[PDB]
Design a protein around this ligand. Structure first.
Ligand SMILES: [Ca+2]
Ligand SMILES: [Ca+2]
Lengths: 218, 238, 231, 238, 231
């Protein structure tokens, strides 16, 4: 069955290489943007492993007299949730900032978690990381476009992936979504203003394993 | 003879795992028949499945010898909503250590398959009772409650007649094997906990001894497999 | 040619990094964080994958000592620039060819190895007033220098994991869950030592490096590659 | 064994391109099936043909971020007898660099075949128009005039409905390949220029946004071929 | 793999122990007990089995010089920790692969051997004012260093006994019947010597070790393995 949530408004203040991202299944875990999964989401904790695909939709309001462009693409094995603070994002940070813009820290991945040296070792000069983002290369991924001249919604499906045939329900975070502004928003004044966004999801062929009680507490 | 050939960067060197042999010494060698001897043994897995004794602590035993890490447990008069015995699913614990499987694995890298878990009791035969058993896969908390155990991989053993019972682990692993060494209680090796609860309290006629004893075993199952033997440590020489 | 054949493409050797020559049983560096006074033998336990690494242990970010002075001990890392700049894909698996490269001319040495995630313990024993580090023999092979020698060898895939993720987004542990750290994605560690007793420990200083080659690999799915600053 | 043989002046030496292998380590090796994973990828040419984004400058963009070398261009209200955009036929330019083909070639010596050139527009759909396109082979002057472009290898794209269009270079070369590296704008590699002219000016109804945007792509064609991969540079680590 | 195949399992080499380099015909150590003044050449007659041993003769218990000083001469022993910790069986038989390991760099040496229970006698003769220990030639093979060299070889089962008891409970002799001592369960003894006359005896001191490998073995019946102290 389908599941759906909401996302902020595409605003004129947003620019090219401005975006936001969503993790799978972390969206359900956080009920991100009002998202709710319910029965299977609770089942997650009672089953120590799982394996499934996905099937999604996204929507946003446009009008003929708008110009600008947006992009949607799934990307796996990313650490986009990690902030420069070194942790995944709570419900407040993205709900507040509402649109990320590219910077060297994410063009390099330097924000990834790191270790405390202790007094034993010299402090390094952080300069590089492998989880960078090169936006010019993202067209390789199959993707879909939402633009005033094109559409107001999109649909995509993806398979399961992972270094093992199945993975822990709690830790498996192979797939991540990102949505980015291809061209800044604009329209002759008075038209549909700063449309909001929504997203829908379905898993495909999900199979729970490792049956046990709900998540022996932390 | 003299002809262009291929050298190597490390010709004639010695590595501990050299695969081939060298010049022999002599011919005319003769050896006697071993036929009169019983049963040449070929593989570890042949013997690893024989039930071995576990080494559970003796509940603050006050003897000057102190602990008695021993395969048996005594029967309590009282019970609580927490197992008689619990332990992580980890090969490094002493009850694992001195088993056949534990001794083997102590010189291996990774493990695969499942193990046989055998159970035993030692009290007077005029006793009737039952016990609950629950394997707890990895979770966010070590099981305590009987109801929790019921949610876990669980079964109940009838002590009504048989004072012994057997069990085999299920092999669930995202990897082909699992790290044998207890480097850390991590997703690579650690696989939750076990639990043990007494289903109902004592039932005995007169003159029967009180608070009897309970015994347990362990040994490999048919599916168990290990990988990459590893070197030993001689500190026990001390 | 059909150079674009990836399997053929990467099957060539390249440097990993240097390490210091050993002269006794060594204290493996402690897990982080590490504090002054916890003396340990850094710079000999040669990790075996070009991933970002630090002090014989993996690493996620890349930081380096751009400055020549400061407080504390200088760690060491390892990156395969060629392959990592050419690695526009997601998952990986292959075998690994490697060969010894001594830095000191005229060297006599012995080397050893243990696999991925294989814990280390040597200690030593006195052979007639002469300590013999246990590692002189043990579970794993060894090779020796012909007063210098190009020792070569290969190792297979070993991890319980089905494949090697080129870049990663999971979490390492149930606690202190380090993102971007797939632990079981290497081949272990080696160590080069003089064939002399601990008593024969010398004042001279020696170093050795190594070259590594990919063998019969397999690759999956796309992945990005670094951008270049336009200046 | 001991027999006359053939030595070499450099036996056992190491060259980066050694063609053969050496002694193995161990037997008994087992590996898991990768069958559950999707689509092992074998060759670069498989992916190189996916349209990639170009990096055209943002016409003196005044943002403190300064330049935005970006695949798109904006629609001008005026036009001149000189292309909207022109550039030499050279693999080293930034618009080439960060493409799939550019990233590949950055570690190759020479190139052969042809590439796909894809075009795009971003304005309101109520727009009607046309554009002229002209590839300029090497000559004594970089094309400016529309008439000059008409003499050059040229075509016209209808923006009437389709806001995207494709093109493929023709492979003309006195040599089998051409030097990939921009050592100099020389007969070995450089192959002229491209030009872009708008055929007719704007046509829009009321309420439609003004001066819309134009987008473009690039990716390899079927005939493209490279030679002799080359080593990289890590300075981007900075 | 099928590592659990015992025959495959143990077919790898490991150190036995060190011995001193010889420079003349030697006095074999006398049978115990031995008294001061009965000067004898200890530490060159290399026994050839990892059983507990003492002064080129077998041993039953294990005792070692945990203290650095005392009265008398320090003996030497030999234990194969890996195999003896893995030896959970009763009877045994196999062949034996072995290779030389010189401790002194840049050494020139010659080595010899004689089988299990083979008594020793060399003496020496003067070749033109130069003594020639008879052992320079004799019943058994010899091998030499290429200014250093990895001399290797193998030997078969030799004892009149049908098999080798892993651990033993019989009695050695009709008199002084030492329990736990199966005498005829080894391969003999070797000896490394300089290819120089006795007159060329030098002040310098040299040492050599050896590695040993099991070949095509056979095993019978279970047996226990050591317990570990829980502390
Ligand atoms: Ca040759
Ligand atoms: Ca020859």
């Amino acid at each position: 069955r389908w599941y759906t949530g909401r996302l902020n408004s595409w605003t004129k203040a947003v620019k090219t290489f401005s975006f936001q991202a969503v993790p799978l299944p972390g969206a359900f875990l956080s009920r991100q943007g009002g998202l709710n999964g319910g029965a299977f989401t609770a089942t997650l904790h009672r089953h120590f492993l799982m394996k499934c695909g996905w099937q999604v939709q996204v929507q946003c309001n446009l009008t003929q007299f708008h110009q600008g462009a947006l992009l949607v693409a799934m990307v796996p094995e990313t650490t986009l949730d990690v902030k420069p603070d070194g942790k995944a994002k709570s419900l407040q940070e993205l709900n507040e900032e509402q649109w990320v813009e590219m910077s060297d820290d994410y063009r390099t991945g330097k924000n990834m978690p790191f270790q405390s040296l202790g007094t034993y070792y010299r402090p390094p000069n952080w300069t590089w990381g492998p989880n960078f983002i090169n936006p010019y290369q993202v067209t390789v991924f199959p993707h879909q476009i939402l633009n005033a001249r094109t559409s107001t919604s999109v649909d995509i499906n993806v398979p399961y992936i992972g270094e093992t045939p199945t993975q822990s329900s709690e830790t498996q975070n192979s797939w991540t979504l990102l949505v980015m502004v291809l061209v800044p928003l604009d329209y002759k004044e008075g038209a549909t203003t700063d449309p909001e966004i929504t997203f829908s999801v379905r898993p495909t062929s999900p199979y729970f394993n490792g049956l046990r009680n709900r998540y022996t507490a932390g | 003879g003299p002809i262009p050939t291929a050298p190597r960067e490390n010709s004639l060197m010695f590595l501990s795992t050299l695969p081939d042999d060298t010049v022999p010494a002599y011919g005319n060698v003769r050896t006697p028949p071993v036929n009169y001897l019983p049963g040449e043994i070929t593989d570890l897995l042949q013997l690893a499945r024989i039930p071995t004794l576990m080494a559970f602590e003796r509940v603050p035993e006050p003897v000057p010898a102190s602990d008695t890490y021993v395969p048996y447990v005594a029967v309590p008069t009282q019970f609580d909503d927490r197992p008689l015995i619990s332990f992580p699913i980890t090969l490094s614990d002493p009850v694992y250590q001195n088993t056949l499987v534990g001794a083997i694995s102590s010189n291996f890298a990774n493990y695969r398959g499942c193990i046989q878990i055998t159970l035993t009791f030692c009290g007077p035969m005029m006793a009737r009772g039952k016990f609950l058993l629950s394997y707890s896969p990895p979770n966010g908390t070590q099981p305590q409650t009987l109801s929790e155990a019921m949610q876990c991989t669980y079964s109940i053993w009838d002590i009504g007649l048989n004072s012994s019972w057997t069990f085999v682990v299920p092999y669930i692993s995202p990897s082909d094997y699992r790290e044998t060494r207890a480097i850390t209680n991590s997703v690579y090796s650690a696989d939750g906990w076990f639990s043990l609860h007494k289903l109902t309290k004592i039932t005995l006629p007169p003159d029967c001894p009180q608070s009897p004893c309970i015994l347990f075993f362990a040994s490999a199952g048919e599916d168990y497999t290990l990988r990459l033997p590893v070197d030993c440590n001689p500190s026990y020489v001390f | 040619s059909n150079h674009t054949n990836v399997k053929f493409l990467f099957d060539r050797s390249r440097l990993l990094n240097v390490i210091k020559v050993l002269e006794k049983d060594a204290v493996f560096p402690r897990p982080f964080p590490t504090q002054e006074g916890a003396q340990q033998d850094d710079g000999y336990f040669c990790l075996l994958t070009p991933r970002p690494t630090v002090a014989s242990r993996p690493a996620t970010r890349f930081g380096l000592y751009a400055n020549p002075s400061g407080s504390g001990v200088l760690a060491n890392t390892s990156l395969d620039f060629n392959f990592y700049s050419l690695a526009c894909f997601t998952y990986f698996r292959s075998d690994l060819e490697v060969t010894v490269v001594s830095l000191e001319p005229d060297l006599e040495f012995a080397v050893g190895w243990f696999p991925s995630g294989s814990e280390y313990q040597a200690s030593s024993f006195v052979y007639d007033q002469l300590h013999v580090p246990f590692h002189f023999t043990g579970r794993t092979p060894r090779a020796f220098a012909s007063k210098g020698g190009k020792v070569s060898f290969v190792l297979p895939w070993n991890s319980v994991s089905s494949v090697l993720p080129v870049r990663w987004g999971g979490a390492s542990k149930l606690s202190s869950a380090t993102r971007g750290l797939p632990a079981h994605a290497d081949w272990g560690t080696i160590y080069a030592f003089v064939p002399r007793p601990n008593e024969k420990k010398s004042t001279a200083v020696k170093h050795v490096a190594v070259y590594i080659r990919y063998k019969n690999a397999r690759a999956w799915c796309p992945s990005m590659l670094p951008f270049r600053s336009y200046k």
